[PDB]
Amino acid sequence: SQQFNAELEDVRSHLLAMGGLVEKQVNDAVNALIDADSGLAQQVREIDDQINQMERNIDEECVRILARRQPAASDLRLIISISKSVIDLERIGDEASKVARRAIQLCEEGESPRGYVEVRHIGSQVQKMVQEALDAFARFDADLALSVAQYDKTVDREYKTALRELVTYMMEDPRAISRVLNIIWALRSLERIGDHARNIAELVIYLVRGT
Amino acid sequence: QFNAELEDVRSHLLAMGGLVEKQVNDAVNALIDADSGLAQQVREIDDQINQMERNIDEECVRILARRQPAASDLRLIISISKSVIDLERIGDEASKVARRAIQLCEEGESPRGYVEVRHIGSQVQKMVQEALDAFARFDADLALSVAQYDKTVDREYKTALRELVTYMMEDPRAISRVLNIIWALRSLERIGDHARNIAELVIYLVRGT
């Protein structure tokens, strides 16, 4: 041991580094959509490969660590929280990358007459949820983690009311359907990003509380 | 010991996979046939699926508690735990398809989309069955064929969407019904990505990368 806990901090810090890269993808995707910025949107998709390769590198790392002799219960909880959470980070990065596709599409089609304030609002919240879940993991802080998980309720709630606004608007202005659907798909991806931040928070709870 | 609990966990996985395939089949059929009873069946199983997932995940964690496994054994258990998340996501997307089927029963049938739902639905159903069969037999050839087919589903989804959108502008009164077909199609495409994910676990376990 006891350099087993070095290699353990190394995989913890690799998680954090992945999370940081993914959080920046969320930031850039949202800005891309709002700013009708194709270049920024493409830059986000091109990161998604590095993110997938980070996830693979972390999974193998968890494998090697585990392979060396049985971990104590708390350590096992940590490795398990890491390997499940890189899946969440990967799915966050993939959703970011879908938002960036919507961004490009809206550049081609013209802006939606509705939904930008909602995208920005939900996006900034869900990006916060990601920072907080990572900060919570980084500090074994199951208090913060709990509130993240709880805030997901209000995000899903905001999503359903924005959907209402946007569907009823589509029925009033059918010419805008293609553009409104793009905002709606982007909002659905932002909601999922918040669902995954919540999952990573719940893993931090399990890690800390033991359950 | 490992061999025994591995077969235990593998045995629960295959049962879970079997229900989920039936869920997808029931949910696609519910939509095409306007059959809300069958959609109800999809939603019922979904609770069992989530149970199986939780159980299977606990078993994996206990197995990881126990030994010190060879790397290759760790890979396998970690991949099993991943694959049950995919199976749960598939189950959940099937439930969404069922919900859409119910709404459509209420609204009367959409003027458009059922041909594409049958088409994409049957392909994605096949992808799941093959992904699971490939996993059951560690057949990496089959796995790779599944993963690569996803691109054609995504392509078919994108052309279906374009045509359904333009149709909704030609006929605004169908908006609510057509949106339901679109949401269902979104779930099916998602089911395809999850079958692709399971097939890719097989490729990784067999070929390394």
UniProtKB/Swiss-Prot annotation, chain A:
This protein's record includes keyword DNA-binding: no
Gene Ontology CC: cytoplasm
Keywords of this entry: Chemotaxis, Cytoplasm, Phosphate transport, Transport
Location in the cell: Cytoplasm
MF GO annotations: protein homodimerization activity
Subunit structure: Homodimer.
Full protein name: Phosphate-specific transport system accessory protein PhoU homolog
Species, as recorded: Pseudomonas aeruginosa (strain ATCC 15692 / DSM 22644 / CIP 104116 / JCM 14847 / LMG 12228 / 1C / PRS 101 / PAO1)
